Design a binder for these strands. Sequence first.
DNA 1: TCGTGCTGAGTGATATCTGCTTTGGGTGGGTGGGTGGGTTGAGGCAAT
DNA 2: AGCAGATATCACTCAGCACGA
Lengths: 705, 203, 664
Amino acid sequence: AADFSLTVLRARIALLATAIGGPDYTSQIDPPPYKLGDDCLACLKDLKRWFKLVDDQQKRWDVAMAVAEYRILTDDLLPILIDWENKCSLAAKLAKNNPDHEEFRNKAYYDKIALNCLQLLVLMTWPLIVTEQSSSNQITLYGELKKHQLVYKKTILSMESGKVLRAAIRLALDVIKIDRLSRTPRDNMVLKLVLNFFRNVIAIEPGEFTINTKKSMPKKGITSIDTLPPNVSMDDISLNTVISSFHKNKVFGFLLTLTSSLSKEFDQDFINIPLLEIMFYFTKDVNQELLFPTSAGFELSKLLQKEHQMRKNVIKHTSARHSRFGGLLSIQTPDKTRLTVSGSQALVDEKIALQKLDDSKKWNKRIIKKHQSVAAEGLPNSLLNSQTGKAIFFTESNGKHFKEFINNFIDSGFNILLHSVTNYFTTEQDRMVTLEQVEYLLFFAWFVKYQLLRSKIDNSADIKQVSEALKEVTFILVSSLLRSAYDLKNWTVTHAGMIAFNELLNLVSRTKAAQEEDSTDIEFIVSRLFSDERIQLLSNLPKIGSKYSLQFMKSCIELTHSVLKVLEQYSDDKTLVIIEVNFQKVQANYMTEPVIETYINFLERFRELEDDSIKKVFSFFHRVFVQAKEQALLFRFDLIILLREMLSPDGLDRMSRSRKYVSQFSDYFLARLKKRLKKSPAWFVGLLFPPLHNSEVGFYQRYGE
Amino acid sequence: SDEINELKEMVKDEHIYDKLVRSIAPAVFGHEAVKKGILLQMLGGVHKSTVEGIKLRGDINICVVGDPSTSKSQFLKYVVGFAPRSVYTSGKASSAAGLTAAVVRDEEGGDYTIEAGALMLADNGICCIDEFDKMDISDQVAIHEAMEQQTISIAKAGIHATLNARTSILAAANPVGGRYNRKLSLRGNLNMTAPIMSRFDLF
Amino acid sequence: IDPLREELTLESLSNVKANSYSEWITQPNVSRTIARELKSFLLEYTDETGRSVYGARIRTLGEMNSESLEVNYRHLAESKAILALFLAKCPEEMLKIFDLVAMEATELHYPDYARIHSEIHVRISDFPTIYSLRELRESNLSSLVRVTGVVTRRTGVFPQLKYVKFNCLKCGSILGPFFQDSNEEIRISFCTNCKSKGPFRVNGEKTVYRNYQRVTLQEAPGTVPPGRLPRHREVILLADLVDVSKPGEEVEVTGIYKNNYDGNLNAKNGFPVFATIIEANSIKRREGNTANEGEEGLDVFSWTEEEEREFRKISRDRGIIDKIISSMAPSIYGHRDIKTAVACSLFGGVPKNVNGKHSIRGDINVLLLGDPGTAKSQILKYVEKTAHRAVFATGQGASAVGLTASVRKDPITKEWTLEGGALVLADKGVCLIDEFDKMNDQDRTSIHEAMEQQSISISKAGIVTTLQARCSIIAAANPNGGRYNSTLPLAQNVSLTEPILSRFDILCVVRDLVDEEADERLATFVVDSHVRSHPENNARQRRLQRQRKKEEEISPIPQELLMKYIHYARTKIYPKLHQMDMDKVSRVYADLRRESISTGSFPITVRHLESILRIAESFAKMRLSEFVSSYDLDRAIKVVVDSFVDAQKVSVRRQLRRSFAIYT
DNA sequence: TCGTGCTGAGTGATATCTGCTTTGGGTGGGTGGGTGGGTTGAGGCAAT
DNA sequence: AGCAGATATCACTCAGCACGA
Ligand SMILES: Nc1ncnc2c1ncn2[C@@H]1O[C@H](COP(=O)(O)OP(=O)(O)OP(=O)(O)O)[C@@H](O)[C@H]1O
Ligand SMILES: Nc1ncnc2c1ncn2[C@@H]1O[C@H](COP(=O)(O)OP(=O)(O)O)[C@@H](O)[C@H]1O
Ligand SMILES: [Mg+2]
Ligand SMILES: [Mg+2]
Ligand SMILES: [Zn+2]
C-alpha cells in the first residue's frame, strides 16, 4: 500500500531522471559536453507536475527525497544551466566581434528549458518549515531533506565556481532589458523567482538535532550533535564561500543595480520584500564590530599570553607530588568539631579547604530552563539565539568585499528600501506573521547600527544615509510592533523590537549630539517616544527579563541603558513634555527587586560577556547605589558571592578595566555595608532574606531610619 | 639535461672501453686483467628464455685465485660497495643458512620456516664469497643448482619451495697448497671439482 | 505499463545516477537491464572460430553434473565494458545477477536441470590485475582481487546454514529465514511484532545447508622479498570450492576483499582496526606451473570437445609417436634416447590388479647418468613444465621425510598429525630429483617402497597408516669422479646399489665426446636457439601469431596442445594386451639375463620384463589406441635392449650389439 | 503590585527490583586467542 | 555475593488563578 506506492514513486522518478539527459561520451572532446534528451522540457514539466500534485496537495515530502536520492539536480539541472550560460556568453562574444554574427538555434526552446530549470531549482531550494499541524511524513523527513539541501547549496556554490548564479543573473537581465511599462506580469514573476533563488541560496544552513524525550536520558548520554551530511564540511556552506562566489560571479553588482533603481524604473511591489529578505539573510549572523577592527601573529601571541596567565592561576590548585601521596587534613570549626579533607593544597591553604568541602558535596538543587526551539516558530538562526561572541571569521579579501557591498548599498538605496518596506507593511500590518516582523526589525536595527559604527570610525560617511529611521512612520510602526508583541506574549518579536528600539534610541542620541537647532524636530520625536505607556513598557521589560534566555537579558540591559541615557541627557538639556517628564520618577520606577535580580543573573555569566556589558551593568549599579541611594536592594548574598567570584585570582584577569570597575564598586559597597552592619546588627540576618514589606518596619529596613 | 650531455660525451670517446677498465677499483694497483673481468660481470649478459619455458643464464661468474696478500679481498670489497645489490660472505658461513637456504622451526607447534641465505639475499645482484675453497659439503652440492639453474629447491618436513637465486658469483679462492705452484695446472692448484669449475665463466 | 518492468539501454546504463555502484545496481530497472545484457553476452558471444564458447561450456557443464560455469573476464570486458567495470567494482550483486542469468542459460539447454543442482555459480578466470598479500590496502575493500600464495593451513569441510530462522523466547513467533553471510553472524535485535529486547532462540523446521571451508593463505616463498617475514590472509571457500586446494600447494585466488569488526583485534591493537578476509570466487592451481602462466583459464590442462576432436585427428596419423618424441624439449639439440625415455615416462603405463590380490606398478622411472654439460637439468625442467603434477627436488635439499610423509604436532588440537611430501604431492604425476648421486644415503633409501609399491607406510607417534604414492621418478646423476669412464662396467661408474638401480626402468647414459661434425652441429643449433630466444627478436593476437611462428621452427606440435594431449591420454586411455608374441619377449628376457650374469653389469630382474610391457603400454597410449599392437611391443623391446647394450663396456659392446641385432 | 493557598501536569530523581558471571579448568569450547595464565614429558625433526 | 540496567512510584518546580490590599 504505502510502501509499494513509495517504491513505484521512486522507480518512476528514477526513470524521469535517467530520461532527462546526460553527458555525451561519444564525442572525443573532454571533459564531455552535456547533451539534452529528446523530451527534456517535457521531463521538466512532468517533474514540476509531480511536485505540485504529490508534495504539496497531499502534504508529504516523498517526491523531494526521491529527487535527492537520484541526484537530479547536481547532475542534470546545474550542468544544463551552466552550458546554456556558456552558450550565451559565446554568443555575446561573437556579437562583440560582429553584431550580425549569430550562433543560436531553437533559442526559444533553450530559454524555456532554462526557465523551467530555474523554477525547479527554486522549488527544491525553498526553505523548509515544520509547524504543529505538519503531517507525520513531513515531520519524519525533516533532517534528511535539510541535509540534501546542504548538499545542494554546496554544489551550487562550488560547481564551475558557481556559474548558475551567472545564469540566474542573465535570466533576470533578460527581464531588465524591457521597459517597466512593457514589463508583463510574467517578467515580474521571473524577477521575483531570481530574487527568491538568491535568498534561498543564502538562507540554507544546518538544522537542529531533535531528540525524543519520552524516556529520561541514558547513562551514556549525548555523544554529539552533528547534522552535516557525509561529504560536506562547514567550510563549504559558510557565508565566506557565499561571499566568494557572489564576488566572483558579480551577484553583488546585480543586487546593487536592482536596489539603486528601486521604485523608479521597476515595479516596487514585486521587488521590495525579496530584497529585504536577501539582505536580512546576508547580515543576520554578522557582528558589525568585527568589520571595524602579521596581525594574526600578534593576536595569537596575546591569546597565548592570556592562556598562560590562566594556567598560572590554575597551577596553585595542583599538587607538586603525585595523587597517591596521601596527605590528610583536619580542620577545626568554631565549635570543637573536626572535618577531614584530602590534598596538599588543603594543608597549605584554608580557602582551598573550604572550596574542596563545598565541591565534594553530592546534592544538587534542580535548575529548570525554559528552552524554545527556534525551528518550532519557523525562524532561522540569527542574533536572537546565536551565542554571544560567535564570530564569522572572514578572510581579508572577503571582508573587504562584504564591507564595500554594504557601504555601497547604504549609500545608494537603504533609505528608499526602508521607506518602501515601511509603507507596504504599515498598509498591511495585521497580515504580518512572526517571521516578517522579526525580519523587518532585525534588518532595520542591523543597518542603523552599522551606519552608526562606520560614522564613528570614518568622519566622511554620515547619519544622513540612515536618516529615514528618524521619520515618524517607521518609528510608529516599530513601536506598534513591539507593543503588540509585548501584549500578546510573543517574546521573539519582543526581542526583535527591543533590539530595534535600542538602535533607534542610540541613533536619536547621536542626532541630538549633532545639532540642537536642527534637533528640535527630533526633540519632538523624543517627546513622542517617551509616552507614559511606553515608559511603563520599557520599565516592565527588565522585570521580566530574568525568566528568559541570556540574550533577552542582554537586550533588556542595553535598552535600559539607552533609555536612561536619553532621559538624563534630555532632562539636563531642556524640559520634556509628553505630561512633563520627571526623570526621578522614571528612575524610581527602575528601582525594584526584579530589576536587580535580572542584573545579577546577567552578571553571573561574566566569563562569556565582553567588557561593555559589565560596564553597563556596573553603571546601572552605580545609579542604584549612589545616585538613587536605594542601597537596601544590593545588600544581598547573590551579589556578594558573585563579587567574590569576580575579584578572585581565578575569576577575572588582573590587567583589565572591568576588574577596575568591579574593584571600585566592591570598595564602595563594602564600606557602606560595614557602616550599616555597625549600625544595625539585625542586618546580619537580613542579608539572607528578601526585603520585608511591612508598613511598621519597612522603612526602617530600607533606609535605617 | 646536464647528465645527458655527460652521458653522450662518454660514449663519444674513442678510448671509452679502456678508460672504464682503468676506472674500476682504482685503489688496486696493476691488475687491469682482473678489472676487465669485474667490469664485464657488472654489465652482465642478456637473459633469454626459450619458447617452452627453458631458461638460459645471462649472468657471469668470476673466480679469482692468488697467493696471500695479493688484493683478492680488495676486489670483493669494491664490488660490494659499488654494485646496487650485493652481499659479502665467506665459504665458512657462520649462519645455519649458509650460502644457500635453510629451514628453521620455532620450537613446538610452529611449523618449519625458511631462512634466507647469502645467495638468496643477493638476488638480482652479485654475491662475493671470500673463501670459496672452504665451503661446506652441503653448500658445495647445493651451489650446483644455484650457479646454473638460478634456483634453490628444498623439500624438508612440511615445507617445499623453489627459491630464486638469480645472482652472479664473484669468488676468491686460495691455492690448494701454500702458494700457487706454476708447474701444476690450474685444476691441480684448486680443490674445486670439474662440475663447479665448468660453471665459472672466467678464471 | 508497470514502471517496475521498464528497462533502460546500455548507454543509459553507463550513466550512473545513484550515490554508489551498489545502489545503482540494486535498482529494479537497472537490475533487469544488467540481467538482460548478461544473458545476451552469454548467448551471443563468439570467438575467432565463430562458435558460441559459452554454449559449449554450458553443454559440458550439464554433461558432467557440475554447478560452476567458468567465464573469462577478458571476454566480458571486450563484449561489455560497463558490465566488466561493475563486476570489478561491485562483485557481490553483479555475481548474484550473473549466477541467476546462468541458470537460465543452463536451463535453456537442459530444461529440468533444477532437479540436479538448485543453483549455478559463475567463476571469473583471468582478472587482469594481480596483487600480493603485501600490496592489499583499504582501497581494495569490497572489490574483486586476485592474489597468490601458499596454502599453509586447512580445515575440515563443515555444513553451514544457508538460511537462519529465529523465534521469540517470549512471544513465540517465528521470524522468517534470513540470508547467512559467509563472513560474520546474523542476529536480530528488534522484533518486528513482539518488540522485545530479549534474545531469540534460533530454530527452524527445515534448513538448507552449504559446504564451508577455511584456509590460511600465505605469501609464496618465491614472491616474498628475500629475508622478510611473509604476510597471510584467511580465504573462505563456499560450496563447490572445498577440497580444491590442498595444503602446501601454490594457488591464485580470485575473490572479494571484505572487512568486519573484531573485538579482540581492537582490544589487542588499541585502535579501531577491522579484520580482513577473502571470499574465494575461483582457484587456479599454480603449483609447478610457473612457466605456464602465459595461458588462460582456471585449468590449462583441461580440454574442450573441439580440442578432443583435434586430439583424435592428430592420433590417427601414422607418425604420431615420432612427432611426440621430437616435440620433447625442442631446444635441446639431440639426445633422442633421453627424449624417448622422457616421453614414455610422461605417458606412463597402465596399473593392474589381478583378481584383487596382486598389484602391479604402472609407472616408468628414468635415470640420467651423464657428463656435466649434457643438458639434463633442462630436460628435468621441461618435464616439470609439461607434467600435470610435478615436484622438483635437489640432492641435499631433500630430507628422508620431506619426501614421503612426516609427523608433526598440530598447533590447534595439540595432537600428532600426518603431512605429505614430495611423493604425495606428485601423486599421479612426476617427481624430479636432480643431483641424485649427491643425496644422503638415508634420503635415498626413503623412496625404495614408494618407487615400486606405490605406497608410503608410516608408523610414528601412534599413527599407523598407509598412503598412496602413484608417482613416477625421473632422476639426473653424475658418474663417480665427475665423468663417465666408458672402459669400466656401469656398476663401477656409479655408487648406487643393486635395488635402486633395478627399480629404474630405463637407463640413459650420456657421454661427452669431442667430434668435429657433432660439435659443429651442436654449436650451430645452440647459436640458432639463442638468437631465436632474444627478447627483442589485435596486439594479443599478433603476439600469439609470432610466438606460434617461432615455435613452428623447432617443434612439430604446439606445446600447450602437447600438454593437453598428454593429460587426455593419461586420463581417458587404458590400453590392454591381447595379441602378442610370447616367445619373442621370453627369449629377449632370457638373453638379457644371460648377458647380465656378468659381474658389475646392469641388474636385470622380472622388473625389467614388466618394464618392457609397461613401455609397450605407454607407446600404445601415445596413439590413443585401446589395444597394444605388435609395433609398440617391438619398439619397447628395441628401447630396452638398446639401453642395456649402451650400458656395457667398450670391449664387449661390439659383441653385445652383434648378438642382439635381431631384436633391434 | 504582595500573600496565601488551591490546582496541576509536567519534569524530573532517587529509592527501588531483574539478570548475569565470575573462579580458573577442561563437569564452557578450538569459527574467543597463544603476547591473559597453565608447562613438564615424550616425541619427531633438522642441523650437526 | 556483587554489579549494571531498568522499571515505576516518589516529590518538587514553575505555572496561574481567586480575594484584598
Ligand atoms: N696491488 C695492490 N695495490 C694496493 N694494495 C695492495 C695490492 N696488493 C695488495 N695490497 C694490499 O694488501 C693488503 C691485504 O690484502 P687484502 O686485504 O686485499 O687481501 P689478501 O691478503 O690478498 O687476501 P686473503 O685475505 O684471501 O689472504 C690490502 O690492504 C691492500 O692494501
Ligand atoms: N644438447 C644440447 N642442446 C642445446 N643446449 C645444450 C645442450 N647441452 C647443453 N646445453 C646448454 O648447456 C647448459 C647445460 O647446463 P645443465 O644441463 O643445466 O647442466 P647439467 O647437465 O649439469 O644439469 C644449458 O644451459 C643448455 O642450454
Ligand atoms: Mg682475503
Ligand atoms: Mg645438473
Ligand atoms: Zn516477536
